[PDB]
Design a protein around this ligand. Structure first.
Ligand SMILES: Nc1ncnc2c1ncn2[C@@H]1O[C@H](COP(=O)(O)OP(=O)(O)O)[C@@H](O)[C@H]1O
Ligand SMILES: Nc1ncnc2c1ncn2[C@@H]1O[C@H](COP(=O)(O)OP(=O)(O)O)[C@@H](O)[C@H]1O
Ligand SMILES: [K+]
Ligand SMILES: [Mg+2]
Ligand SMILES: [Mg+2]
Ligand SMILES: [Mg+2]
Lengths: 324, 318
């Protein structure tokens, strides 16, 4: 049994992916090799991948895709990549062609959960409450059916990259131009203020089990890019202070969203809490995975130790590939 | 120079090579052929052309990924149908190669391949679809409507594992057959009688529609068996003008909502004056009898110009 861990990625969440791989490597209970996708799109292997992990960044790689790995060495691949090309289904598609088991959601579930427009379409169709939104495509003029404040995002983004809070219609065009540097499609959502941000972990194939519910607090107006990964700037409350009926409704909707979207392996489901109004914000199929990230600490509070969590993710991938 | 991938491991293996025979005869660019054999291994160079004239490729030489010189190609034309073809897996690989490629991207391909998720997106957008319910293995089905049913694997092609179910007590056996090909199945209300209409879209997200064509066959449904001679194509379809207009409207709107790139063949159901979108095929057949190329031919787009615009749309996006 040997696992291949792929980290880094060309996405704007590259350094975030390397921080998650350091924690995974220290505690994974399987013999594990590291592959690092550098920012330039080329791969680092062996010692050079380890050296990039210490340097916490990988601007330039050595091997172009596909890299000269013996894929039959590995029984499972752990795609620990955040953002574009990582959790949007593209790497998962390659691993499917390769006939190789891998941790996390499949091609369709990965792509769906990374698209903030299409995931909201499927979720709303299933009766899952989401924020009122509209899609905007490059070139086509925006037609927002509601009034500011807005949150303008690229449709496929992570770590709040490219997201603006817009207060007036005059500031919309600049928020659209920013968002379109990262995607051909943007979403314009109605802003919730004030908002409490709740996050819950799911584990399992399609029919998952939920962790305790946690909460994120911060000083900035919203959970922006600078706040997210600057250590200490964020604040994780586990478990979140909620009425028992609210906690259950959150775990409820997360498992329903998980099942409808056909998610595999894991996902951190994130919610908004207005006053008592719950909205499902997004699903993240490759959450941050440092020993102190929300997802591991949530299941830590649920009786699943970090090494045991990693063990169960790998076996879930083996179970789906060789039996489903 | 264009690289053409054809064959595949899906039951549409022979049709894929047949479609490659059509492309290579009219594509206006230099094109090499790489064939994926039915066993997953690839065949390259002159060996691939040998599998083409042989009309089939049971076994291949190189295991995936093939030792292919990707740097010598500017665009890749993945002419693979069904699973490991139109489902985003091949598209992901090409995204990691960094090559421009023809057709829908990873997300659009996986979405249009999933008969459950595509309906959810289309229904939320107000595009009409038939009443349906998803069924997952290990969970008992809850079907709120009455027979006859169509049971399908959620990710299938060429009606593989699809049953027309006329009795409720035959639903258990049909789900079992569909569950040998996919972990998820759909149970759709069967339309009867029904007319099957098809329309081609061309363009990145904001496409242009072809004329509307109709398939008329002599089978219980347009199954895999339906055999050049059991399915005639009416081009254009004999439709009253209002219906022909709505078909093109719904086609372009669904094309836009799903963010399809390059091309798609959008198939509809006509039953008692009501249209229903059935599925979007992101890699439609390209044999000189297939519906997609002939539809744009009737609309004034010559087959070489069709293939040029497909390649140019790939280069424009990437
Ligand atoms: N509709 C909204 N109302 C209030 N706050 C929002 C809204 N959309 C986004 N935000 C804020 O922006 C942050 C990032 O948005 P999100 O959709 O999670 O992007 P990402 O996927 O990059 O995390 C959220 O954590 C939230 O604080
Ligand atoms: N709801 C339905 N009502 C009537 N006929 C159907 C229905 N669903 C499928 N069929 C028949 O089965 C055939 C194949 O269905 P389809 O969903 O297109 O499978 P595939 O993806 O293999 O093409 C269709 O051409 C149609 O004739
Ligand atoms: K996401
Ligand atoms: Mg996110
Ligand atoms: Mg978020
Ligand atoms: Mg069909």
């Amino acid at each position: 049994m040997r696992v291949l861990l792929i980290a880094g990625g060309v996405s704007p969440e590259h350094e975030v992916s390397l921080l998650s791989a350091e924690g995974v490597l220290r505690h994974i209970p399987f013999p594990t090799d590291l592959a690092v996708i550098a920012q330039d799109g080329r791969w680092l292997l062996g010692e050079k991948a380890l050296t990039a992990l210490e340097a916490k960044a990988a601007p330039e790689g050595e091997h172009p895709f596909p890299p000269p790995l013996s894929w039959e060495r590995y029984d499972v691949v752990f795609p620990l990549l955040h953002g574009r090309f990582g959790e949007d289904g593209t790497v998962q598609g390659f691993l499917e062609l390769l006939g190789k088991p891998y941790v996390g959601a499949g091609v369709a579930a990965s792509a769906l959960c990374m698209d903030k427009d299409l995931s909201k379409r499927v979720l709303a169709q299933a009766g899952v409450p989401v924020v009122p939104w509209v899609a905007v495509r490059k070139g086509e003029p925006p037609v927002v059916p509601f009034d500011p404040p807005f949150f303008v995002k690229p449709a496929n983004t992570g770590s709040s990259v490219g997201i603006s809070r817009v207060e007036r219609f005059q500031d919309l065009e600049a928020a659209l131009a920013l968002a379109f540097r990262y995607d051909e499609k943007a979403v314009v959502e109605k802003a919730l203020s004030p908002v409490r941000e709740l996050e819950v972990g799911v584990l399992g194939n399609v029919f998952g089990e939920a962790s305790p519910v946690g909460e994120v607090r911060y000083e900035a107006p919203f959970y922006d890019y600078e706040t997210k990964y600057t250590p200490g700037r964020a604040e994780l409350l586990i478990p979140a202070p909620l009425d028992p009926g609210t906690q259950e409704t959150v775990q409820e909707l997360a498992l329903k969203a998980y099942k409808v979207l056909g998610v595999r392996g894991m996902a951190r489901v994130d919610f908004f809490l207005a006053e008592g109004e719950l909205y499902l914000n997004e699903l993240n199929t490759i959450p941050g995975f440092t020993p102190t990230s929300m997802y591991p600490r949530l299941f830590e509070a649920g009786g699943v130790a970090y090494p045991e969590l990693l063990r169960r993710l790998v076996e879930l991938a083996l179970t789906h590939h060789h039996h489903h």
